[PDB]
Amino acid sequence: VDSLRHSRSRLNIYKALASPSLIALSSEDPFLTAFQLSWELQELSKVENEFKAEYEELSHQCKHFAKDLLDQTRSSRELELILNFRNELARLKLAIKYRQKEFVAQPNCQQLLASRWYDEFPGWRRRHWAGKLITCVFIGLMFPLLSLCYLVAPKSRYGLFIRKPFIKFICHTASYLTFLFLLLLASQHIVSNNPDRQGPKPTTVEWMILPWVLGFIWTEIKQMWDGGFQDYIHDWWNLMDFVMNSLYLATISLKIVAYVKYSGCKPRDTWEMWHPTLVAEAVFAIANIFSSLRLISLFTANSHLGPLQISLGRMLLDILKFLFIYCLVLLAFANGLNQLYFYYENSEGMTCKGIRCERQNNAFSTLFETLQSLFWSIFGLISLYVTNVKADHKFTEFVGATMFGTYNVISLVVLLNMLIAMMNNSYQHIADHADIEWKFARTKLWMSYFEEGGTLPPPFNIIPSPKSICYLITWIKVHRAAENVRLNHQYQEVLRNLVKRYVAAMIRDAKTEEGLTE
Amino acid sequence: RIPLRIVRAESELSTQEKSYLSAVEKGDYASVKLALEEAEIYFKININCIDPLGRTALLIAIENENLEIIELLLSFNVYVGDALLHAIRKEVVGAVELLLNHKQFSDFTPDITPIILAAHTNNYEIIKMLVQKGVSVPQPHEVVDSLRHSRSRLNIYKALASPSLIALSSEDPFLTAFQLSWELQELSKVENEFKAEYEELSHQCKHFAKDLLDQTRSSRELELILNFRNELARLKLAIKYRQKEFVAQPNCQQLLASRWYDEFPGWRRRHWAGKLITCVFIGLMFPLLSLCYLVAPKSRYGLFIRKPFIKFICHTASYLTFLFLLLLASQHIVSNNPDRQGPKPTTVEWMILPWVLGFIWTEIKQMWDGGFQDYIHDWWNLMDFVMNSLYLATISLKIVAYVKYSGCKPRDTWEMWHPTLVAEAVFAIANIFSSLRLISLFTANSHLGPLQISLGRMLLDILKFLFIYCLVLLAFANGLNQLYFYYENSEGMTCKGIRCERQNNAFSTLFETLQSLFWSIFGLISLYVTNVKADHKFTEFVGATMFGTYNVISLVVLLNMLIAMMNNSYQHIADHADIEWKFARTKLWMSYFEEGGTLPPPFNIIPSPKSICYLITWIKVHRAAENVRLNHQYQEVLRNLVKRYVAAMIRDAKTEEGLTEENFKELKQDISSFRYEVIGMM
Amino acid sequence: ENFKELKQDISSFRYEVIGMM
Amino acid sequence: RIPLRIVRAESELSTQEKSYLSAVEKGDYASVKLALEEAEIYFKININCIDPLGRTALLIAIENENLEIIELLLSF
Ligand SMILES: CCCCCCCCCCCCCCCC(=O)OC[C@H](COP(=O)(O)O)OC(=O)CCCCCCCCCCCCCCC
Ligand SMILES: CCCCCCCCCCCCCCCC(=O)OC[C@H](COP(=O)(O)O)OC(=O)CCCCCCCCCCCCCCC
Ligand SMILES: [Ca+2]
Ligand SMILES: [Ca+2]
């Protein structure tokens, strides 16, 4: 009934709640309160988009409180108590879920996480890059042996060696590189079948590819289950994985269909369009591109290519908005050019029609062909003589050439440079939080390799376990801890000490370090 | 809703405790004395009470700069605890004086000792009075509780890298600053979680060195500083430790330029025309100067090439002569005929040969006198190594072709991988590298120098970006080859690939796909390479869509991201443009100060007067009282510079500051204590 | 330096007043 | 480890010197006049003493904007 008073009062009682002093004097767990409150303020900056800025600032403040409350730790045992509070590292996973980038990227958190990342490799900081490279290649090369040992004897001196997060990250990376090299071999004439064969009866390389595909699909299914479907799609790499595995499923199904419907062989030139085998090769090639692009996500692990890859991923949204505007410009000029040129569509003579031919014939004679012509015009791949017709109509040709020239001016010397300008503005800010965001991403990647589940790489992922039927049959068959209180009190003492230190060192001394006004 | 209650704030103060702490706040000496004397007959006060936010009575008096109340409180035996540490952290010299001679929760990490915290504050008076007592700081190692260990190491490196502590101790502050900056730089690699912090510390050390050298008032004293242990030894040491600010100090550069010319008074007041004429003049007679230094290296002209600028001009002239010889090597007027296997090298190549041998000899000498780690730190040195390897390959391949192909036949009929053909190829690549070795001679120029250095400083971001682009390229190459390898065609065409008039198979092999996608980013691949000799419009459309998506990703997304990253890089790089360029120019200049490496490469390979004495003997292996005098004279110089530095950047720079809220609180407290005294004594 | 001057003026004022009464 | 000792900071002040320089710091005209008049019968004070960071009595009074003490010090 009074929107102004209501919104203002809500802002006033959220700015009060998100106060380090009030969170320190009250709120049994300041860490949980800070996380929840930052999340709530972030959501309100979407709901209340007129006060968005203000709410965002408040949210940010909460985040720093968490960080600055964790910087008051003086011991690794106390910090471990803070981070392992309710399998393990539970409070850190909670921080990851609430997107507390500053809390995660705190130096002591990262130091503890790296110590848990190596677990058998004292050094790797004082070691020279040569020995690092040799040993990573070495362990990657014998990834299948390590996985085999974990299959058969997952308790020996070698079966537990893959249990170490860095070792199993190397093993998964090696298995993925093996997969990609198999995709490369799939396009070599030395290990392929002949092209004049409908229903190819898949070769040895494709057979070896198949276990990787099944393992990838199984891993994606497990992620979709253990984590839900909302958090699953928040990662764009997960969407790319879903598309990749859908495409590989399509490849398998189309190959199967072609094998059970096309038992004959005939030269490929005479095949008909939309042949199941042809579509199978097409979708397999698209899936190959996506599989090989899934290799850029393994650079969050690298301190040199990590911040860069994260920042490039952070510029994409501006690219998408700009490309939406460009698509509208493209559609406008396509509509105009097609309207001008569709009366002179020509077939007699030429045997290949379109712009994908040596002599680029009809380029604006259909809307689809116009769209392709205007797309390839921005890379200079459309010649200037496509604006002509087989008549002496110099006026229509001149008008068409002027539409085409205006489209090139708008897109190549106006919009493209505006894109450069917007990207520069974006990268000014993005590079400020480059280390924080990259360390958040690397923490997510690292933490994905801390669990016992998902230890074997995909080729060995699909192996009937020792039971293999016990957790399979039973899964569908649905249709006195006094340590808890002790842990809670010990955490309470830790938290008391941290809040005391925080009040002393950032409320009492930081206020003193100020600038006196009039 | 939300009832609010106190948590984790247990202790609250009685009325007497609040009154006594408020008296200590206001500076009321009479009230504090009264409450403290009433704290011994019948205590009932808890003399060591703690206010909210901690802030004990002794600590309150410390925060108020009230020395009278501090002496009184100590006279009544209060628990000082960390009083010394809060006094030091606040830079309170009087309280530090009182608490230094006086016979669980804390605001300080238990590894913090008084001297460490004092050195953190960089206050010279407190550090001075702590050192006299006999404190010491732990020594960390070269380079169970990870948090405590890392934090303690950082605390004792931030203390060590303190201008006040380096000035009060450390017999040679210059050596200490150099070594400490180097150590902190290495630790910013080992301890990559605290990297930033260590880097900042390292930077601070560097400035100390610079600001300790800015306190020189005489060129003789500065020469003593820089020539300390042939000559300019301490400057070479600064170069080795990468002390860019120390090297780029204006007085260092002025002295270095004076040693750079040595016969050319002027060159600052001279017009560019005379400069150009005389440089061309001396370059033109470089061979005569080198000849004189060969035969009579003591005459009025044999010593003329000994001057660093003259010999830099001579080396540049010899290099330009070499490059012009490479240009002549590709002219049909001074070459042999192409239909000749085993060419029997022409006159131009013969004249090229001494330059090649001299270049190889120079690179060998650099690899020796300087080691192999410092040698490869320079990228120009790697380029030189590749260049000379390529020229060695050229000579060897020409020799092989001369002793295996004595016949002549038309070139069109030659076979691939012919030694002569490979010789020409590697020679051409070496020509490119030789001609690119000419960009390094622009660090000597004040206009093209900072630019060339900055462009060299952007390359690393280019390499990271190009690694990402290579992955994108490999992804789309894999996809396109997978789509197109079934339509590989041979019948008809006689030239296959994209390097032909009618660009045939472009994605039919992985190598050809890689080339197609590489040349696609310059628009040199036509659109009709995505077609096949069949009516399969679906596969052609899918291939054209892979190709179009690759062009969108690479030409309008990645390329612009590269522009953005380069812009961000160049914002920062251009800030330290002069400093880095002057460092690079100092390195270039200093490379021409020695007696070794004086003759240019064509004359470098000449049997010396002995030519066998240092050759035979080199393999046959299988009472200086001036030193102490130099050391003491340097010590006096260093004493004066440290005195000046303390006076002019510790005493005056601290004064030039901005007063915080604590200064207003101190002023108010002084007025209140004055008020209470006056009212109480009348 | 201005805060130091102010503090010094107050202290000298204080010493005069205390010493003359 | 790393025992720390004073280098290149030779001169240290006696108790009377510190008291007199502290009086000049605080602006104490009576104490400075007394110590300066006791610096002529039996000197034992080194009227021109130098504090750490230099900062001589005259220079101290200059830094404190105290003109009365400056006139007195010049008068002696
Ligand atoms: C440095 C790069 C500068 C880019 C070029 C600037 C154009 C300068 C004028 C060129 C004229 C010379 C040709 C004359 C002969 C002729 O008739 O040629 C006309 C030419 C080509 O036609 P012909 O080949 O048939 O002659 O076409 C054009 O010149 C069209 C230019 C229009 C410019 C539009 C710019 C408006 C900005 C866009 C707004 C941004 C958002 C829009 C999205 C909704
Ligand atoms: C101002 C410059 C703007 C650049 C152009 C924007 C593209 C707009 C859409 C064009 C569509 C028109 C053609 C329609 C007909 C057709 O089918 O044509 C499709 C065309 C060409 O195919 P055809 O010639 O066979 O028709 O191909 C494409 O359109 C592909 C566009 C995909 C865009 C990808 C952008 C994603 C950003 C990359 C992420 C960065 C990192 C990635 C590395 C891992
Ligand atoms: Ca996934
Ligand atoms: Ca070299």
UniProtKB/TrEMBL annotation, chain B:
Residues 144-195 form the Transient receptor ion channel domain. GO terms for molecular function: calcium channel activity; monoatomic cation channel activity. It catalyses: Ca(2+)(in) = Ca(2+)(out). Ca(2+) binds at E363, Q366, N381, D384. It comes from the Eukaryota. Keywords: ANK repeat, Calcium, Calcium channel, Calcium transport, Cell membrane, Disulfide bond, Ion channel, Ion transport, Membrane, Metal-binding, Receptor, Repeat, Transmembrane, Transmembrane helix, Transport. It is a multi-pass membrane protein. Disulfide bonds join C495-C500. This is Short transient receptor potential channel 4b. It comes from Danio rerio (Zebrafish). The gene is trpc4b. The chain holds residues 17 to 753 of 915 of the full protein.
UniProtKB/TrEMBL annotation, chain C:
It is found in: Cell membrane. It comes from the Eukaryota. This is Short transient receptor potential channel 4b. The gene is trpc4b.
Automatic annotation (TrEMBL), chain D:
The lineage of its organism: Eukaryota, Metazoa, Chordata, Craniata, Vertebrata. The gene is trpc4b. It comes from the Eukaryota. The chain holds residues 17 to 92 of 915 of the full protein. It is found in: Cell membrane. This is Short transient receptor potential channel 4b.
